[model samples]
Target chain A: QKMIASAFNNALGAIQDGFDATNSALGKIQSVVNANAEALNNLLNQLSNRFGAIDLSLDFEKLNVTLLDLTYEMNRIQDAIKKLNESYINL
Target chain B: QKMIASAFNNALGAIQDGFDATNSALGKIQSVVNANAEALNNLLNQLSNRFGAIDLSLDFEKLNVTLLDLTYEMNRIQDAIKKLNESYINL
Candidate 1:
């Protein structure tokens, strides 16, 4: 009985650890998303200020570059979270 | 001893359910992220095509509106994932 109970206790502990790790990774991902949003807003502001008076076509290459950067960050976030998910499942 | 064993089994089953639900929610969030990225790329392409020849300032208000929509979707994703995390912890 003692042995069985100990095994169950250990399993519970592992599950708790998985939850903690998963939540921690999620918090970090949320921060990255927040940063991405902020970056977008700031980029828009800068572009608006610089091009507001011109009738010239805005250089969209610059915006595309920034978007690519955000996409890369988002990919990183996905990879990290995927790792945590796999870890949780394996546990 | 049998009752205790049964209780532990039930707990483990609950934990498994939590993990399943969490994974499902994460999958949905991932889809949303992918959609946001696509929308961004498409918007960039449209803007670039329209303004490529003009010397005039682009109308940033349209881009800003799109960003705001993506931000709102991100918020929904965050909320859903947060709920899943809470459920996992409670389990």
Candidate 2:
């Protein structure tokens, strides 16, 4: 059981790393989009007055917040498993 | 830039799948822990009155909600990239 719990913990840690990297990539992408937004807007303005063709919300803050919350939850699960191990082992 | 966007989209797709699997695993783990909670509580009661030694909130609902939000955000990014491609390729 402990081994399984430990394995799950490791898996979760790896996933967390993946998510962190993804978040970094997202941040970079957001920066790029924002940097280009003015140019894109100018182009769109020239192309047509219906330049509001697509939703230009490149916000990643919500995603980042959610990821942080997920990390906290993962930690809580790990802690619970640790306690379970301690209590059961002594019995 | 299109290539880079495509690559990021692929990466995000893979990450989304990873998160989905993690969510599934979390659900299973939660079910297992909940099923055993009564037994564990009984044991804890026998051991000590301070059985609340651990916070047993195995609720993954919030995490699931966040994951859903992440998926939506990922989709939005993908859509924005696609629109960028279409709008730029014509230029």
Candidate 3:
């Protein structure tokens, strides 16, 4: 069992690099989504202003409702980035 | 790298023992909660009856609303436990 455990562990270690690579790629998604809420709000406003009335109104409402639902769904998505950062350091 | 793999896996395995210990404790809670909703209905009926008409109505409504919310939130929590069980076997 010890040898089996060691072999499994060795295999898992080799896959660790793959996990790390995926983690790096996933970070870029986290980067964009993790932008400051204030910045996102401003950007949303700017986009709404630039677009034509029909397009802007529809897009804005969709995004606004999505953001609202996301806020409701995620208990702490807003504070999560800081927590993840702390966890990464600790790990 | 093989040594590193063995070490990490060994560490994770021990950590998993701690996790399983915690999980077993949690399982008791799950078991209580898992008593068929039908089984709970009987308990609720007994309690409510012993209390009074007003008590029964209030308790029923409260549990009704809570059961609805639990049905939603437990989606994540229950599936996660099932996944962990599967991982244990695969390991």
Candidate 4:
């Protein structure tokens, strides 16, 4: 380990702890998004399956599935999210 | 700012660079979620506004706005996301 002051090491340790938490939190979001996206997806897909379309209902149907893909954006959002955290510790 | 090696300074600069980016990237997501959430919310609210009600339409209607709050969860998710970033650099 580099011979920084205990205080500095402590600070870096705290920094590491912080990054670990958010890193895990960011990692956890992957599952959260995946679970939520699929649930929303299936719900919409289910509705579309159950009902015949309303020209209007198509909006709902579009909405139904639109729900899912937006999460995918969050996925990209998370990719960008973690990429920064990735540098913090190399831990 | 501390007198580490130029190599270390550069590495820390690199590290700082990485955080700035992810920090900015994470910062950018707030607006994104806000924007996208509103769009979806309006879409669903729009549908529900137009249709009187279908028992089935309620599902879509539920879905119509369920879109927005999920983003709220991401808000919490982002809160947790950035709280970690906040510690870095004190920037």
Candidate 5:
């Protein structure tokens, strides 16, 4: 005599689980997308300094120094463009 | 007979390796920043379309659709702003 422990399962349940997992994952991604993108948009709306910003400083403070350098570089370019246009206007 | 394999090393090498690794990683990040940020600036210089673009589609195609939707939303805002200002001009 053999006593067997039995469990009930089917391919249908397995298939449904797969779909359910995928759906859950997709919904999570959707949440992240909506949250981040909307947050960025909101931040854009709030920024009114004749400017805006992004943080490329992913890990630590070092990149931020570089970012500050870049910002200064951009301002230099901005100054150049303004001077160039000013010359245009005087003529 | 007890035989042991001996390798020579010290805290100096280990300490220097740590510094080297950190420095190497930092340099890598610096490279990425210079390349990417400068490339973005160059792209900005090239864009003459009174318009431009960015990709938030990080992992797959789904978020791009959302980004497109957000773009359309921004255009709506732009249209509203333009029309609002247009009325100011007409008056």
Candidate 6:
């Protein structure tokens, strides 16, 4: 009986961990979105000021380069999280 | 022996779960960053089209506003993760 209870508790505990991890992931993603929004807003302001008088042009190449780098980094991190989730699923 | 082995496995598994959870958060954050990069890139292109062919200067106010929001968001997430880590430590 004790063994059975222990097993049940263990499994239950594992489930809780999984839930916590998912929640943590959600929070992290939220953070990133918030951070990026702020940064982009700032960039927009700069763009506006520089080009405001003249219709506010920006440098596509530089902008694209930074965004591309961020995209690649994000992809790598996302893949890693997916693998981690898989690990818990298998366990 | 089996009982002790199971206990060891359970403890080890918990630690592994913690690691995976941390990793998962990182990945999710990355995904958000990537997605935002795409959106910001679009905005930048628009800025370029609107304000091209002029001397370029940036608006610090806009840049700071967005970045400040992001920084706050990041801090919130980071704090949540720290709490999660604390839970594991207590465990």
Q: Score each candidate by Cα lDDT.
A: 0.50, 0.38, 0.37, 0.44, 0.31, 0.49
How are the candidates ranked when ordered by TM-score, highest leading? Answer: 1, 4, 6, 3, 2, 5
TM-score of each: 0.52, 0.27, 0.29, 0.49, 0.25, 0.39
Better structure of 1 and 3 per lDDT: 1
Candidate 3 per-residue lDDT, tens place, B48-85, comes to 45445321222232343111112222333333333323
Q: Which candidate number maximizes DockQ?
A: 6
Quality of candidate 1 docking, DockQ: 0.04
Tens digits of per-residue lDDT for model 1 on A1-91? 4445445445544454445444544554465445455545554654666466556446656655322234454556556545544432222
Provide DockQ values for all models, in the order shown.
0.04, 0.01, 0.02, 0.08, 0.01, 0.18
TM-score of the first chain alone, every candidate = 0.57, 0.43, 0.35, 0.56, 0.42, 0.53
Tens digits of lDDT, candidate 4, B1-91: 3444334434444544454455455455445544654665566555555554544343653343222123333344334334333332311
The lowest-lDDT stretch of 10 consecutive residues in candidate 1 chain A is A82-91
Write one digit per residue (lDDT tens) for candidate 1, span B30-64: 56755775666476566566557655335544444
Q: Report, for all candidates in order, the number of backbone clashes.
A: 8, 0, 0, 0, 0, 16
Specify the CAPRI tier of model 2: incorrect
Candidate 3, which CAPRI tier? incorrect
Q: On TM-score, who's better, 4 or 6?
A: 4
Off by over 4 Å in 1: A54-91, B55-91
Task: Give the alpha carbon lDDT tens digit for every residue of B1-91 in model 2.
Answer: 4574456445545645665554454345444434444443354344333322423222222112101113443444344333322211111
Expressed as tens digits, the lDDT of each residue in A1-91 for candidate 4 is 2333322343344344434434544554444444445545655564554356453233653463332234445456556545644443322
True contacts kept of each: 0.00, 0.00, 0.00, 0.00, 0.00, 0.24
Model 5: residues with Cα > 4 Å off, grouped in runs: A1-9, A49-91, B1-91
Per-residue lDDT over A1-91 for candidate 2, one digit per residue giving the tens place of the 0 to 100 score:
3443343343334444444434533443344333333333332232232222325444345323111124454455556445534422221
Best by lDDT: 1
Candidate 4 TM-score versus the reference: 0.49
- Give the root-mean-square deviation of each candidate in angstroms: 11.3, 28.0, 18.1, 8.2, 31.0, 10.2
User: What does the interface RMSD come to for each candidate?
Assistant: 9.6, 24.4, 16.3, 7.1, 27.0, 7.9
Candidate 3 structure quality by residue, lDDT tens digits, A1-91 = 4444444444343233322322332332233233322333544453354343222343554555122123332334324423433321111
DockQ (C-alpha) of model 6? Answer: 0.18
Candidate 5 lDDT, tens digit per residue, A1-91?
0111011113223423543443344345445544544554354344322122422212212212122122232233333323222211110
